[PDB]
């Protein structure tokens, strides 16, 4: 977590003498370089220069603006100051897309050009669709997007849930989970989501209900050799002398006895995609999950990792709202051996030997 702090900077130090560009005071009608001069002159405190015209604030600024209208290329990185980016358009530091609901189909093993051997897990993304959007009272950033999966007969769900899919008109889905999207990542209800929504190299987070183990002891749940102290603040004797100490008289919260052992909601938050099969709507991940086959796994993107945004300048940039296909792109025209999109090598070197 050390090396995870951004550049520290307070608020009492964002003043005129620190801004990278001309510090701009607000005056109602328009910005300006000088402080607002109070209208009632009786307010003006002693030794407070109500500057009507300063040259240095007006000269340094004058050369600045002229140089940007005349030499755009050199002063490129100073064009977001006065021309801010619009809304939508996939800001990289701000936009969070939505994921989709996949089903664990099977497992296999793949190999890169290098002699490496991966343990692949084919996830099937059957029939995803944005079934509705929701916001907590129109608050900011509290947006959500629910995505159904696996169209099903109406005779399947209970009434009180099928009646919900009979609200937004979408086909009655098998299940639908929700992802917190940014208001720029929205899409109209019903957008048939393709699997190509994901790119074959991004680090994708999944969440699922791992395999149920019933009721196991300690040797299986937390099986260890020895421990259970977390003694912490409670006093104890070292270096005898003034000694009266206290000990435990209750099973402190968070002990480690027997329990359920695993019907919870697991979360892998760094799995990189391996092979997007966009004919069969399959995604392969080079990891084995401890989940029963047939589970539903909600896919997201690892928004950032190791310190760098996922959809940054260098690496690819996603199909932002979603992946909309063409008009003539009929996947049924091509065999499953053509609708494949493999990945770059995940390892820099053959992992039986060492780094050259």
């Amino acid at each position: 977590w050390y090396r995870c702090y951004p550049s520290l900077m307070e608020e009492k130090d964002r003043d005129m003498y620190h801004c990278y560009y001309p510090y701009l005071f607000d005056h109602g009608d328009k910005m300006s370089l000088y402080p607002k001069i109070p209208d009632n002159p009786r307010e003006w405190q002693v030794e407070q220069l109500q500057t009507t015209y300063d040259a240095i604030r007006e000269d340094k600024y004058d050369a600045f603006v002229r140089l940007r209208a005349k030499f755009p290329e050199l002063y490129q990185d100073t064009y977001a100051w006065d021309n801010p980016p619009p809304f939508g358009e996939f800001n990289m530091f701000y936009s969070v897309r939505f994921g989709m609901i996949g089903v664990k189909a099977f497992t296999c093993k793949d190999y890169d050009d290098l002699g490496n051997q991966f343990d692949c897990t084919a996830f099937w993304f059957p029939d995803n669709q944005i079934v509705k959007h929701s916001t907590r009272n129109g608050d900011v950033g509290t947006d959500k997007v629910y995505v159904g999966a696996m169209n099903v007969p109406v005779e399947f769900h209970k009434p009180h849930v099928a009646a919900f899919y009979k609200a937004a008109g979408v086909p009655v889905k098998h299940v639908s989970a929700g992802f917190p999207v940014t208001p720029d990542a929205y899409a109209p209800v019903g957008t048939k989501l393709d699997v190509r929504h994901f790119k074959p190299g991004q680090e994708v987070t999944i969440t699922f209900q791992n395999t149920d183990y019933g009721y196991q002891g300690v040797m299986f749940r937390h099986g260890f050799d020895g421990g259970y102290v977390w003694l912490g603040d409670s006093k104890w004797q070292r270096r005898p002398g003034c000694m009266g100490a206290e000990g435990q008289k209750r099973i402190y919260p968070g002990h480690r006895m027997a329990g359920q052992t695993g019907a919870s909601a697991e979360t892998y938050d760094g799995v990189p995609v391996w092979r997007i099969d966009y004919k069969n709507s399959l995604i392969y991940l080079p990891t084995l999950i401890d989940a029963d086959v047939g589970t539903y796994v909600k896919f997201r993107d690892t928004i950032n990792t190791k310190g760098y945004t996922l959809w940054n300048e260098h690496r690819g940039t996603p199909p932002f709202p979603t992946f909309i296909p063409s008009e003539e792109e009929d996947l049924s025209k091509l065999a499953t051996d053509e609708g494949q999109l493999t990945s770059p090598p995940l390892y820099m070197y053959f992992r039986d030997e060492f780094a050259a």
Binding site: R14, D26, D29, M31, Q48, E58, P84, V96, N304
Partner: protein, 290 residues
């Protein structure tokens, strides 16, 4: 470095890139459990608050001078250097990311004052190749005829920024004559007032340029007037420094040598030649005082 080809970067130069996804190392990624709610892909926008995003519905926050709700109280600096409508959060809740609803209104950039349009200005190309103290470094970076004082013959608009060098030397950078007037009859009145003028002479005769330091004169007025200094510059103008009650030699040298930089940059604006100070016998013989 290289052709940016990520394959031809490893296979050729062996620039091993840090494992990004499948490594066994930490893979620094906070906010995995500590941050409840929508997290934006901006990396560490919540790491000084204690890696949480819970609060900040609240407008008020403990603020030292200049921070959030300190904008009503008066404080000289932030009253001339901070838009009051700009005061944000407190001292550790600094906003590395702020998201608000509502349309965006861009109050236009402020235009320029006292520039009659349709007056094409000549421009100065400032460069670091210049010595950074040359007089061409303090002239305005855009020269308007609206700013050239013509009543006195001046080609370019006068400078607007002055060097911050605390001058403890004197010289004839563009002076022509520095006289002082004192009174030996003066005994009690202004003991220190005389103690400064005479001292400024003893600290003026040690001026800094290859001139004969006898550009300085010392007159004995029997007028019984408080000692007064008169400095006249090459072009002719005279500067009478103010000898107030409680001003010593070290103060005067900063007075004149500032009004002697403006006089130089006024003369350099009037077409007078430039006597550039440089290393001659005084940047030495003062280098030994080390």
């Amino acid at each position: 470095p290289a052709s940016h080809y990520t394959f031809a970067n490893l296979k050729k130069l062996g620039l091993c890139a840090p494992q990004v996804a499948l490594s066994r190392q930490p893979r620094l990624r906070p906010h995995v459990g500590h941050l409840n709610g929508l997290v934006y892909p901006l990396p560490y926008y919540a790491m000084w608050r204690g890696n949480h995003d819970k609060y900040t519905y609240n407008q008020a926050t403990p603020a030292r001078w200049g921070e959030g709700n300190t904008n009503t109280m008066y404080h000289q600096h932030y009253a001339h250097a901070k838009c009051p409508t700009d005061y944000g959060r407190g001292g550790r809740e600094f906003q590395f990311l702020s998201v608000k609803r509502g349309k965006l209104k861009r109050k236009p950039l402020p235009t320029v004052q006292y520039v009659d349009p349709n007056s094409k200005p000549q421009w100065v190309f400032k460069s670091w190749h210049n010595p950074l103290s040359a007089p061409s470094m303090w002239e305005r970076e855009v020269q308007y005829p609206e700013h050239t004082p013509a009543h006195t013959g001046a080609k370019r608009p006068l400078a607007v920024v002055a060097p911050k060098t605390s001058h403890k030397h004197l010289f004839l950078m563009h002076m022509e004559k520095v006289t002082v007037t004192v009174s030996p009859l003066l005994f009690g009145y202004g003991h220190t007032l005389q103690k400064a003028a005479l001292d400024f002479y003893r600290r003026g005769l040690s001026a800094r340029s290859p001139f004969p330091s006898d550009k300085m004169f010392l007159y004995y007025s029997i007028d019984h007037i408080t000692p007064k200094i008169e400095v006249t510059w090459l072009d002719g103008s005279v500067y009478v420094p103010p000898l107030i009650e409680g001003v010593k030699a070290q103060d005067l040298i900063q007075m004149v040598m500032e009004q002697a930089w403006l006089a130089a940059d006024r003369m350099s604006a009037e077409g007078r030649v430039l006597n550039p100070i440089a290393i001659d016998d005084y940047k030495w013989e003062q280098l030994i005082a080390f």
